[PDB]
Structures are given as C-alpha cells and as structure tokens.
Amino acid sequence: PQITLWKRPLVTIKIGGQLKEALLDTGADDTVLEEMNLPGRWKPKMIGGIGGFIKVRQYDQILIEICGHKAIGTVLVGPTPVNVIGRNLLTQIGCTLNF
Amino acid sequence: PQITLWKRPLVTIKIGGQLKEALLDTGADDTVLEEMNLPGRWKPKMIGGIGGFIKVRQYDQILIEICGHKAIGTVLVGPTPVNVIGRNLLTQIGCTLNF
Ligand SMILES: CC(C)CN(C[C@@H](O)[C@H](Cc1ccccc1)NC(=O)O[C@H]1CO[C@H]2OCC[C@H]21)S(=O)(=O)c1ccc(N)cc1
C-alpha cells in the first residue's frame, strides 16, 4: 500500500503470536517494541535518541508479520514509549520513501 | 525519488542559507535540528523522544529545502542526536511510505 504521513504511520504487526500496533519508522535503525516476555536468549543493549538512552533486550531472528508481509530479524525489547518498526525490518517488506 | 532503507535515509537540506545533512524520519512528528544559528524569532519548548524530554527553540514558518523540495514550517533546534526531518515537513514535500 501507500501510507501518507498526515498522521503517525501506525500498522498492526504480529510477533510471538500476539498482535500489536507499531510505527513504520524510517528514522529507527532497528525495531524496538514495548516490554514483552519473549522466549529465548537475548543480549543487553542501549539505544539512544532524543532525550538520551534506554536499556533494551536484543532478540535475534524474531519473526514479525507487518500488514501480511513477513520478516525475520532483530527485535529490541524495552521501556520504549512507542513500538517502532525500524529499517532492519522495513527493508524486508519492500518499504520505500517516495516523493 | 524513491529511497530504499538499507542505509539511513540521509539527505542534504538547505536552511537559513546553509547546507546540512538530515534524516528523513517518519517516526518523528516534528523536525528537530542540532544547535545552529537561525534568523527569526523563537520560543522555548519541550519535545520528548525515546530517552526523555529536551529543551528546544521553536522557530515557526521557516523556509527549508529538502532534496530540492521546498517546505515552510516549524523547526525545533536543540540537542538532538541527529538532524531529523519529521512528518510536519515530510507531508509538505509529498513524502509517502510504500510497500
Ligand atoms: C531520533 C531518531 C534518530 C531515532 N529514533 C526514531 C524516531 O523516529 C523517534 C521515534 C519515537 C516516536 C515517538 C516517541 C519516541 C520515539 N521519533 C522522535 O524522537 O520524534 C520526536 C520529534 O518529533 C516528535 O514526534 C515523536 C517523538 C518526537 S529513536 O526512537 O530514538 C530510536 C533509536 C534507535 C532505534 N534502534 C530505534 C529507535
């Protein structure tokens, strides 16, 4: 589809057998999701933006479905104010910016 | 143009007669630039990101050219980790997400 930017580009995703809402975020290097109890091992990481850094748990090779498009890759989990699908997964669904 | 997301969607912008590099950021409502001298009146404001809130100077109705596309709108100046072009200007240059 085509998504205009009048409002936040929020879409439904499916991750770990759960449905959530997330932003399609071209400004996010990596996908970051609200606190959720995913199984498997993980690695500590800190990610920075406006306001400073938050601590997140890095899970690798996580399957996510974004508008029926499947992708699998890194998912960071932590106390983020919003769920963002970052470029690491946006590339996998064929997402481009166009003007 | 059509911009893929294998690397950061960085573009050259012109603001206040100066060239700068900036990130096309669909997850940003607003446009936030690093500390710089901008001609015009400004008001102090707060803006919140992934790591908390920062103090910015709000400049209204500023001319800004993004990759050869003119916009006139609000620009926030403050200690952002990187220059981000948010939706308030992305809409003006006709930017959409497509997949
Ligand atoms: C600042 C960017 C270079 C990086 N950010 C993505 C960006 O889209 C955030 C994503 C975002 C969105 C909402 C809340 C927090 C973070 N937007 C943002 O900070 O925008 C602010 C300016 O406009 C306002 O509108 C939203 C917040 C304000 S980030 O959230 O900090 C981030 C950093 C690293 C990763 N892997 C993922 C995300």
**Residue B62 and residue B37: Cα distance in Å, rounded?**
13
B86 in contact with ligand 1, CB cutoff 6 A: yes
- The alpha carbon dihedral of A88, A32, B8, A23 has a sign of positive
Catalytic choice (A25, A29, A30, A60) = A25
Tally DSSP H helices, then E strands, for chain A.
Answer: 1, 9
Paired strand residues for A11: A22
A29 in contact with ligand 1, CB cutoff 6 A: yes
**Residue B34 and residue B84: Cα distance in Å, rounded?**
9
Which residues in chain A have Cβ-Cβ distances shorter than 8 Å to B53? Answer: 51
Neighbours of B83 (CB within 10 A): 21
**Residue A44 and residue A91: Cα distance in Å, rounded?**
24
- Resolution value in angstroms: 1.9
Method of determination is X-ray
User: Is the CATH code 2.40.70.10 the one for domain A1-99?
Assistant: yes
**Residue A90 and residue A82: Cα distance in Å, rounded?**
17
CB A12 within 8 A of CB A21: yes
**Residue A28 and residue A74: Cα distance in Å, rounded?**
12
